[PDB]
Every structure is written in structure tokens, then in C-alpha cells.
Design an enzyme around this catalytic site. Structure first.
Site, mmCIF file in Angstrom:
data_model
loop_
_atom_site.group_PDB
_atom_site.id
_atom_site.type_symbol
_atom_site.label_atom_id
_atom_site.label_comp_id
_atom_site.label_asym_id
_atom_site.label_seq_id
_atom_site.Cartn_x
_atom_site.Cartn_y
_atom_site.Cartn_z
ATOM 1 N N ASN A 1 -8.858 4.946 3.021
ATOM 2 C CA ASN A 1 -9.188 6.315 2.144
ATOM 3 C C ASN A 1 -10.567 7.249 2.188
ATOM 4 O OD1 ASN A 1 -12.499 5.901 0.142
ATOM 5 N ND2 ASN A 1 -10.245 6.769 -1.078
ATOM 6 N N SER B 1 -10.988 11.078 -4.525
ATOM 7 C CA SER B 1 -10.785 10.716 -2.742
ATOM 8 C C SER B 1 -9.135 10.156 -2.223
ATOM 9 C CB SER B 1 -11.419 9.748 -2.768
ATOM 10 O OG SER B 1 -11.372 8.409 -3.013
ATOM 11 N N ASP C 1 -15.528 -5.020 9.344
ATOM 12 C CA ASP C 1 -16.782 -3.780 8.263
ATOM 13 C C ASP C 1 -17.698 -5.107 7.624
ATOM 14 O OD1 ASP C 1 -15.807 -4.272 6.584
ATOM 15 O OD2 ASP C 1 -15.836 -1.598 5.783
ATOM 16 N N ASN D 1 -7.519 9.606 -5.599
ATOM 17 C CA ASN D 1 -8.403 8.095 -6.809
ATOM 18 C C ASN D 1 -8.512 8.615 -7.708
ATOM 19 O OD1 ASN D 1 -8.678 6.441 -3.167
ATOM 20 N ND2 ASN D 1 -7.118 6.002 -4.904
ATOM 21 N N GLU E 1 0.578 -0.817 -0.034
ATOM 22 C CA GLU E 1 -0.228 0.113 0.319
ATOM 23 C C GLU E 1 0.670 1.232 -0.085
ATOM 24 O OE1 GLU E 1 -2.749 -0.013 -0.575
ATOM 25 O OE2 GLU E 1 -3.886 -1.841 -0.261
ATOM 26 N N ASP F 1 -12.051 9.203 -8.144
ATOM 27 C CA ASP F 1 -12.932 9.118 -8.135
ATOM 28 C C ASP F 1 -13.141 10.613 -7.164
ATOM 29 O OD1 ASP F 1 -12.937 8.523 -4.577
ATOM 30 O OD2 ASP F 1 -13.956 6.788 -5.299
ATOM 31 N N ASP G 1 -6.165 8.393 -0.580
ATOM 32 C CA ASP G 1 -5.816 7.647 0.378
ATOM 33 C C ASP G 1 -4.384 7.196 1.434
ATOM 34 O OD1 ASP G 1 -7.630 5.527 -0.698
ATOM 35 O OD2 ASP G 1 -6.135 4.056 -1.681
#
Ligand code: NA
Ligand code: NA
Lengths: 129, 129
Positions: free
Chosen positions: A59, A50, A101, A46, A35, A48, A52
């Protein structure tokens, strides 16, 4: 901070990640390598819009507030900036909420594609924990 | 830095003090409590003009150079100032040389008088290591 492999393994162990939700320490070290290359200050945009943040590339779409991800959530109740500290505590506590989650470590694309199904014990070999 | 009991136990474990020369972690935590009250910045003058430094009150007569202990030795090859850091590494590495020198933890008066022969496991109870 850029961690050494064995240094990060020890830190993650101290923060209670060894077998958290049944993921061995090697899984967590493998995820952080792919990562962030073990760099707490890693940031990646990202597509979109967003971002990280940190050693586990958490994110802003779901997990933290960075003030420029419109219509996102802050499920870890933190500023994304907290995830860049030399102190890995905020990244670990948020990672516990993510892995709990319902998708486990599949939440990390790099874990799914590079760690899952591999000999992850090799990531902690030669380390004093 | 003033450490919490369990925080120092974990740090000493990370630095390889658990059963070093056969002294359990509880012995090391007990010694630090009674020597420094867990304060890395602790300093105390001795009658002989030497000074004790840090979490384990390492003495300038034998172990470190502080520039004002005439005719002393520097067996740990460090400035005493290194033993006051929030980072306990220099104190731990010097403590290993002291406990290895033939008197074990009897080198620490407070260990001999307050820890030796007691239930030292009580110093690490309730800690995640
Ligand atoms: Na957000
Ligand atoms: Na000296």
C-alpha cells in the site's frame, strides 16, 4: 509476470521468506494468491485514494511512493513502480519490513481472512523447492 | 550473464542438480567456474572444429546443433545458441543427459582435472540456498 504456484514458492524460498518472522512458505504463497492471483503487475485503488502494488499488494499510504497518495509515508524507501517488476526482490524486501512492524501477516487483510488458521502447507505441496 | 558463485549454486539447486546422479552441488559449481568462469555466453573453439557453449561448455560434436560441426550429433535436440541464454535451463537439462551417459562428470575435462577429488563443498560455503 503471472507466476505458477510452485514457481513463486521457490522464488520466495530463494528470497528468504520460508519461516521469516515464523511464517511458513505456505502463508506467503497463500497471501500472494488472494492478494494478486500471482500477478506481479496487479494494482488496486483503495477507497482512501492510496493504491496497492504487486504480488503482495503493498500500500502507497505507508510503504512506497507513487506520487499521488497525499500525506502518505514511504517506509520501504522505494517507488511503488518497483513493486510491479517480474523480479519479486523489491516486493519481498518491503514485505519483510511490513511483517516485522508488530502486526505480522495481519497487515494483509486477504491473509487474515483467507489464509490464517488454514492448512497453508497445501499451497506448497507438489513443488520442488 | 556472468553469475556470482552463490547465485549460480542457488539456480543449479532450483534446477535439480544437487546430488543429480550423486554429484553434490559443489561439483556443478566447480565445473562451471573452470569451464566458463560463470559466464553463460562463453564459447570456445575445439581443435576438431566443434565449439563448446555456455556455463558448462557443452560440445557441438555430440550434444547440440550449431550448423558448422560437420558429421556431429545433436543428442540434447537443441540449437547450441540455446546454451548461451541468461536462463540456465537448457544448459542444465542437457548437462543431465551428458552426466547420465555412463562417464558421469568425467565428460567435463575441467571437472576431472580441477574438481574431482577436491573439497568441492567450499564452492557453496557462505551461500543461502
Ligand atoms: Na506513500
Ligand atoms: Na552437433
Amino acid at each position: 509476470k503471472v507466476f505458477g504456484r510452485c514457481e513463486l514458492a521457490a522464488a520466495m524460498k530463494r528470497h528468504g521468506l520460508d519461516n521469516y518472522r515464523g511464517y511458513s512458505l505456505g502463508n506467503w504463497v497463500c497471501a500472494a494468491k488472494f492478494e494478486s492471483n500471482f500477478n506481479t503487475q496487479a494494482t488496486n485503488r483503495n477507497t482512501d485514494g492510496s493504491t496497492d502494488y504487486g504480488i503482495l499488494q503493498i500500500n502507497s499510504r505507508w510503504w512506497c511512493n507513487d506520487g499521488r497518495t497525499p500525506g502518505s509515508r514511504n517506509l520501504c524507501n522505494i517507488p511503488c513502480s518497483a513493486l510491479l517488476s517480474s523480479d519479486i526482490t523489491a516486493s519481498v524486501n518491503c514485505a519483510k519490513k511490513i511483517v516485522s512492524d508488530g502486526n505480522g501477516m495481519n497487515a494483509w487483510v486477504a491473509w487474515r481472512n483467507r489464509c490464517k488458521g488454514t492448512d497453508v502447507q497445501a499451497w506448497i505441496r507438489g513443488c520442488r523447492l
